[PDB]
Scaffold this active site. Sequence first.
Site, PDB file in Angstrom:
ATOM      1  N   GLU A   1       0.864  -1.204   0.000  1.00  0.00           N
ATOM      2  CA  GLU A   1       0.000   0.000   0.000  1.00  0.00           C
ATOM      3  C   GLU A   1       0.898   1.251   0.000  1.00  0.00           C
ATOM      4  OE1 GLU A   1      -2.928   0.053  -0.838  1.00  0.00           O
ATOM      5  OE2 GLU A   1      -3.937  -1.806  -0.269  1.00  0.00           O
TER       6      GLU A   1
ATOM      7  N   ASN B   1      -7.622   8.194  -6.247  1.00  0.00           N
ATOM      8  CA  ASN B   1      -8.390   7.105  -6.917  1.00  0.00           C
ATOM      9  C   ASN B   1      -9.117   7.701  -8.140  1.00  0.00           C
ATOM     10  OD1 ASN B   1      -9.140   6.155  -3.535  1.00  0.00           O
ATOM     11  ND2 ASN B   1      -7.559   5.209  -4.830  1.00  0.00           N
TER      12      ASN B   1
ATOM     13  N   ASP C   1     -12.191   7.611  -8.875  1.00  0.00           N
ATOM     14  CA  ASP C   1     -13.495   8.198  -8.473  1.00  0.00           C
ATOM     15  C   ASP C   1     -13.303   9.582  -7.816  1.00  0.00           C
ATOM     16  OD1 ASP C   1     -12.614   7.599  -5.907  1.00  0.00           O
ATOM     17  OD2 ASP C   1     -14.312   6.311  -5.405  1.00  0.00           O
TER      18      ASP C   1
ATOM     19  N   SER D   1     -11.721  10.131  -4.932  1.00  0.00           N
ATOM     20  CA  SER D   1     -11.385   9.905  -3.514  1.00  0.00           C
ATOM     21  C   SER D   1      -9.863   9.797  -3.452  1.00  0.00           C
ATOM     22  CB  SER D   1     -12.087   8.683  -2.960  1.00  0.00           C
ATOM     23  OG  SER D   1     -11.598   7.496  -3.569  1.00  0.00           O
TER      24      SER D   1
ATOM     25  N   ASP E   1      -6.557   7.899  -1.037  1.00  0.00           N
ATOM     26  CA  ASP E   1      -6.040   6.917  -0.066  1.00  0.00           C
ATOM     27  C   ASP E   1      -4.913   7.580   0.747  1.00  0.00           C
ATOM     28  OD1 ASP E   1      -7.810   5.042  -1.179  1.00  0.00           O
ATOM     29  OD2 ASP E   1      -6.215   3.726  -1.993  1.00  0.00           O
TER      30      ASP E   1
ATOM     31  N   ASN F   1      -9.197   5.018   2.471  1.00  0.00           N
ATOM     32  CA  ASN F   1      -9.888   5.761   1.400  1.00  0.00           C
ATOM     33  C   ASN F   1     -10.829   6.788   2.052  1.00  0.00           C
ATOM     34  OD1 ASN F   1     -11.095   6.552  -0.997  1.00  0.00           O
ATOM     35  ND2 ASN F   1     -11.530   4.496  -1.736  1.00  0.00           N
TER      36      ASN F   1
ATOM     37  N   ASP G   1     -15.675  -4.888   8.507  1.00  0.00           N
ATOM     38  CA  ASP G   1     -16.819  -4.417   7.672  1.00  0.00           C
ATOM     39  C   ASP G   1     -17.506  -5.595   6.974  1.00  0.00           C
ATOM     40  OD1 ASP G   1     -18.337  -2.016   6.874  1.00  0.00           O
ATOM     41  OD2 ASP G   1     -17.709  -2.557   4.835  1.00  0.00           O
TER      42      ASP G   1
END
Length: 129
Positions: A35, A46, A48, A50, A52, A59, A101
Amino acid sequence: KVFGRCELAAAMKRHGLDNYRGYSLGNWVCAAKFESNFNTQATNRNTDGSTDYGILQINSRWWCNDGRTPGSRNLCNIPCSALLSSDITASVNCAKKIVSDGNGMNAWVAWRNRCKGTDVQAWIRGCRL
Ligand code: NA
């Protein structure tokens, strides 16, 4: 801060990540390697829009507030900047919520693609833990 491998292993262990949701410490260190390369200041945009943030590339779409991710949530209730600190407490605390989650560490696409099913214990080899 750029952590050493065993330095990050020790920090994650102290913060109760070792076998958290049944994920051995090597899984967390392996995720952190791919990562962020163990860099707390790692940021990546990202597709979209967003972003990280931090050692585990958490995110802004779901987990932290950065003020520039329309329609997003802040489920860890933290500014995304908290995830870049030399102190990994906020990243660990938020990673605990993500991995709980429902999809376990599959939430980290780099863990799924690069760590899942591999000899993750190699990542804590030689570390005094
Ligand atoms: Na957000």
